[PDB]
Amino acid sequence: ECSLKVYLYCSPVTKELLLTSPKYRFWKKRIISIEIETPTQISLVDEASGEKEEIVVTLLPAGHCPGSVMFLFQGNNGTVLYTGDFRLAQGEAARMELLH
Amino acid sequence: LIFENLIDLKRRYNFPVEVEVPMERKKKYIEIRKEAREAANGDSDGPSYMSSLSYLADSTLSEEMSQFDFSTGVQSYSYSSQLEMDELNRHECMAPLTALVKHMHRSPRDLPSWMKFLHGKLGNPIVPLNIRLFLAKLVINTEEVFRPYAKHWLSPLLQLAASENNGGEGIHYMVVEIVATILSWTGLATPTGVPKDEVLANRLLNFLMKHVFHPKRAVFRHNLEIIKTLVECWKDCLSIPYRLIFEKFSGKDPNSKDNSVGIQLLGIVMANDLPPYDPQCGIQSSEYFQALVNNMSFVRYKEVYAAAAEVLGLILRYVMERKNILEESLCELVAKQLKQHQNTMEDKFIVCLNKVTKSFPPLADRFMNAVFFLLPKFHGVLKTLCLEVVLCRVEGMTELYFQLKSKDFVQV
Amino acid sequence: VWLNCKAAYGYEYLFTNLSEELGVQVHVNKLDMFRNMPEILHHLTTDRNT
Ligand SMILES: [Mg+2]
């Protein structure tokens, strides 16, 4: 309630599952859902100072639960990957288009 | 009468929409296009469809993993939609009739007496639906013995498919089967001579594009495939229903994917070197192309704005060679829609520009400075798209090496 | 048949496939969370007579 440029990015299914709970309905105006396999640019603008920083994030399916996705960041410090609670069978890592 | 006795005439023959498409169901249309493209045209240069129309035999990894995380679970569309299939093949006299026909065949050619009887019973729209369906299944199972006479059997199957009162609702397996049979028959006979066949084919195409959508991705791709091969075979006989497509890609809803169907239909139309618009419809050129270009403002789903940008670029490339007088207005609208989000989001702008300049290079000459400004600020695939936009216009640039040196091209 | 599922989400695959292969609808406490997901909502029910 004291900021305007900070948001919560997640899958659309995750947004639907999160806004249903009454305890988390205060995030209704601060959640930005992102489609999977769609490279989008995120602005890491500072609140106090007018400094800004752009980063590219890509959401990859995880196959864990409704709304579970991965996070593939690409910026100045190289490419990092966050596979939070994923599930992949053997021989499926070679089938992800966005990781190639 | 002899046929109405051995048929029920009262059983509601359930025809469900085929969901689990087999592997041969794709290669049959593949070979149909292979025959209708070279055996009857002799060109061997298949139409280059857009990225959204690129097809694979199996499904992508996201489709397979969607069974667990439901990535496509959120309802985005708004269209209203709904072996126990071959019950006609499980008829008492079905196999005996097929054996009889196969035996008697081998036991400008005109139809014999039995073929005349079959044609009189099938082509007549007053004959009950069950008898016509049985005759259609018999012709399907014995298409090899009907090919030398397929010039006569083209109209009955056409008017059976184009009929509003068919077996089931939607595009069921009987429709796709008879369509595949007719398109395999297109190598020798085409609905081009008799205007009745032309209007039958037009109504069939309208019916296909009317019920092309289906929430299941596989059957939706199959319907797009059958429409694609149908418009590829009968390219010189069909009038495209531009009014239906306009209503398809004009939804004006930022959080929906309804326009994707219309954009893909327009791309299928444009890939066969067809006009993107005909003034015969009630929609003028202004609002038509306006609603078409407005899809680039829907920056939520890529299948909407990226596909719209690509199909718009194809339309620009088409109207470029034909020297039409709407090229200036279309280019102005596209440049306006691009500059609208050039500075707001600047990440969908580069994607839309790369999709447009993929087929219409001369549009990047006004955004070259913008993409050179945005190049140092991009990462990942966005920088690659910007470099591709720079690549599409290299010979036209006066002096390029200084800009690349100033933009640290070597470390890139 | 009871299904002692500890996690809140992750077992919807089992529920949907059992419903599609048996025609019966699984009973859950809350299902309003899947109101915008038709492929999952039409497999769950609040009635206890299943
Ligand atoms: Mg987990």
UniProtKB/Swiss-Prot annotation, chain A:
Q: Where in the cell is it found?
A: Nucleus
What happens to this protein after translation, modification-wise? Answer: Phosphorylation on undefined residues by PRKDC may stimulate endonucleolytic activity on 5' and 3' hairpins and overhangs. PRKDC must remain present, even after phosphorylation, for efficient hairpin opening. Also phosphorylated by ATM in response to ionizing radiation (IR) and by ATR in response to ultraviolet (UV) radiation.
Summed up, the tissue specificity of this protein is: Ubiquitously expressed, with highest levels in the kidney, lung, pancreas and placenta (at the mRNA level). Expression is not increased in thymus or bone marrow, sites of V(D)J recombination.
Endpoints of the signal sequence? none
Name the domain of life this protein comes from: Eukaryota
Assembly and interaction partners: Interacts with LIG4; the interaction is direct. Interacts with ATM. Interacts with BRCA1. Interacts with PRKDC. Interacts with TP53BP1. Also exhibits ATM- and phosphorylation-dependent interaction with the MRN complex, composed of MRE11, RAD50, and NBN.
State which disorder the record connects to this protein: Severe combined immunodeficiency autosomal recessive T-cell-negative/B-cell-negative/NK-cell-positive with sensitivity to ionizing radiation: A form of severe combined immunodeficiency, a genetically and clinically heterogeneous group of rare congenital disorders characterized by impairment of both humoral and cell-mediated immunity, leukopenia, and low or absent antibody levels. Patients present in infancy with recurrent, persistent infections by opportunistic organisms. Severe combined immunodeficiency Athabaskan type: A variety of SCID with sensitivity to ionizing radiation. A founder mutation has been detected in Athabascan-speaking native Americans, being inherited as an autosomal recessive trait. Affected individuals exhibit clinical symptoms and defects in DNA repair comparable to those seen in RS-SCID.
Per the record, the similarity remark reads: Belongs to the DNA repair metallo-beta-lactamase (DRMBL) family.
Instruction: Say what the protein does.
Output: Nuclease involved in DNA non-homologous end joining (NHEJ); required for double-strand break repair and V(D)J recombination. Required for V(D)J recombination, the process by which exons encoding the antigen-binding domains of immunoglobulins and T-cell receptor proteins are assembled from individual V, (D), and J gene segments. V(D)J recombination is initiated by the lymphoid specific RAG endonuclease complex, which generates site specific DNA double strand breaks (DSBs). These DSBs present two types of DNA end structures: hairpin sealed coding ends and phosphorylated blunt signal ends.
This chain's protein is named Protein artemis
UniProt source species: Homo sapiens (Human)
- Of the parent protein, the shown chain spans 52 to 151 of 692
Curated annotation (Swiss-Prot), chain B:
Q: Which residues carry this modification: Phosphoserine?
A: S81
As stated in the Swiss-Prot or TrEMBL entry, residues carrying the post-translational modification N6-acetyllysine are K248
Its subcellular locations are: Nucleus; Nucleus, Nucleolus; Cytoplasm, Cytosol
- Residue(s) at site: Cleavage: D45, G46
Q: How is it modified after translation?
A: Autophosphorylated at two clusters, the T2609 cluster and the S2056 cluster. Autophosphorylation induces a conformational change that leads to remodeling of the DNA-PK complex, requisite for efficient end processing and DNA repair. S-nitrosylated by GAPDH.
Q: Which family does it belong to?
A: Belongs to the PI3/PI4-kinase family.
Linked disorder?
Immunodeficiency 26 with or without neurologic abnormalities: A form of severe combined immunodeficiency characterized by reduced or absent T and B cells, recurrent candidiasis, and lower respiratory tract infections. Some patients show dysmorphic features, severe growth failure, microcephaly, seizures, and impaired neurological functions.
Which protein are we looking at? DNA-dependent protein kinase catalytic subunit
- Organism annotation: Homo sapiens (Human)
